[PDB]
């Protein structure tokens, strides 16, 4: 019963913070940037595409923070542990969330109101990183994640008692074990335990996210965006 309540409260936090509705993303699959619109994005300055992408990624991060803040027990952790878990996992969650807005049939992503391929981002000059982000979304797309699966799986991406630097490791372990039981219970109930052998290897998500954040840091160093900072303790760890 506590476990059914936890499934309900994780799914509710996800629903309130998912940013884009799955029904909207699936309906808009036929709404694809024209050749003319793609060329318009490619001709934009590296620095304007950077400003647009940095602002979208900031907002995506801020929704993952509100998601974490609404997870049962997260706000009862010490601030040090909250920041450790968000600093390690918030961008891993953004990259997982991306698969909902990715169409494997044509290798497009929902960006600024329509679907486009990775060639939309040509001006940024990051083709190998962007290709690795699209390939990651392409792998995840094969799971056909349900909304509840993405919610419980992303909760576990964040609530990981193995992150270095935790001060109350036993408190994070308690949350982790309850979220693992919630997730395994839900998969059993839905006859979806077969996704467990297909989830990304932990190291893949960590290295891809580490490369992504390092690229964002390089862009931010060369051309700082102004951030609407909502979570000062976490902002202070990423920006300088
Ligand atoms: C490496 C940097 C400079 C470039 C990254 C380019 C691409 C991969 C970025 C730029 C804007 C990003 C999107 C911004 C917002 C969201 C909404 C979120 O709900 C899921 C991920 C998603 C859909 C992001 C996917 C990745 C994305 C499309
Ligand atoms: C694990 C994390 C990575 C990451 C986080 S958290 C944040 C962030 C954002 C907002 C707040 C807040 O207080 O509103 C707090 C944190 N930005 N960010 C980045 O990689 C990033 C981005 Cl998205 C854009 C430009 C430069 C950079 Cl470095």
UniProtKB/Swiss-Prot annotation:
Stimuli inducing this protein: Up-regulated in the state of obesity.
Cystine connections: none
Motif residue range(s): AF-2: 234-239
Consequence when changing residue 111 to Q: Completely abolishes transcriptional activity
UniProt-reported outcome of changing residue 130 to N: Nearly abolishes transcriptional activity
Domain (NR LBD): residue spans on this chain: 2-240
Task of the protein: Nuclear receptor that binds DNA as a monomer to ROR response elements (RORE) containing a single core motif half-site 5'-AGGTCA-3' preceded by a short A-T-rich sequence. Key regulator of cellular differentiation, immunity, peripheral circadian rhythm as well as lipid, steroid, xenobiotics and glucose metabolism. Considered to have intrinsic transcriptional activity, have some natural ligands like oxysterols that act as agonists (25-hydroxycholesterol) or inverse agonists (7-oxygenated sterols), enhancing or repressing the transcriptional activity, respectively.
Subunit structure: Interacts (via AF-2 motif) with the coactivator NCOA2 (via LXXLL motif). Interacts with the corepressor NCOR1. Interacts with CRY1. Interacts (via AF-2 motif) with the coactivators NCOA1 and PPARGC1A (via LXXLL motif). Interacts (via AF-2 motif) with PROX1. Interacts with FOXP3. Interacts with NR0B2.
Notes on the domains: The AF-2 (activation function-2) motif is required for recruiting coregulators containing LXXLL motifs such as NCOA1 and NCOA2.
Noted disease: Immunodeficiency 42: An autosomal recessive primary immunodeficiency characterized by increased susceptibility to concomitant candidiasis and mycobacteriosis. Candidiasis is characterized by persistent and/or recurrent infections of the skin, nails and mucous membranes caused by organisms of the genus Candida. Mycobacteriosis is characterized by infections caused by moderately virulent mycobacterial species, such as Bacillus Calmette-Guerin (BCG) vaccine, environmental non-tuberculous mycobacteria, and by the more virulent Mycobacterium tuberculosis.
Protein name: Nuclear receptor ROR-gamma
Biological source species: Homo sapiens (Human)
Recorded name of the encoding gene: RORC
Residues of the full protein shown: 268 to 507 of 518
């Amino acid at each position: 019963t506590e476990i059914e309540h936890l499934v309900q409260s994780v799914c509710k936090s996800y629903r309130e913070t998912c940013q884009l509705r799955l029904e909207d993303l699936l309906r808009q699959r036929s709404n694809i940037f024209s050749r003319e619109e793609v060329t318009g994005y490619q001709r934009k300055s590296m620095w304007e595409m950077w400003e647009r992408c940095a602002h979208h990624l900031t907002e995506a991060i801020q929704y993952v923070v509100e998601f974490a803040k609404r997870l049962s027990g997260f706000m009862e952790l010490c601030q040090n542990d909250q920041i450790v878990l968000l600093k390690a996992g918030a961008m891993e969650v953004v990259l997982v969330r991306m698969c909902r807005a990715y169409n494997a049939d044509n290798r497009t992503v929902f960006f600024e109101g329509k679907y486009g391929g990775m060639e939309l981002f040509r001006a940024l000059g990051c083709s190998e990183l962007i290709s690795s982000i699209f390939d990651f979304s392409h792998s995840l797309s094969a799971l056909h994640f349900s909304e509840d699966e993405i919610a419980l799986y992303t909760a576990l991406v964040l609530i990981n008692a193995h992150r270095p630097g935790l001060q109350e490791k036993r408190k994070v372990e308690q949350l982790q074990y309850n979220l693992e039981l919630a997730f395994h219970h839900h998969l059993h109930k839905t006859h979806r335990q077969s996704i467990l052998a297909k989830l990304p290897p932990k190291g893949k998500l960590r290295s891809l996210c580490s490369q992504h954040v390092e690229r964002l840091q390089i862009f931010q160093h060369l051309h700082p965006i102004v951030v609407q900072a909502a979570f000062p303790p976490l902002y202070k760890e990423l920006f300088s």
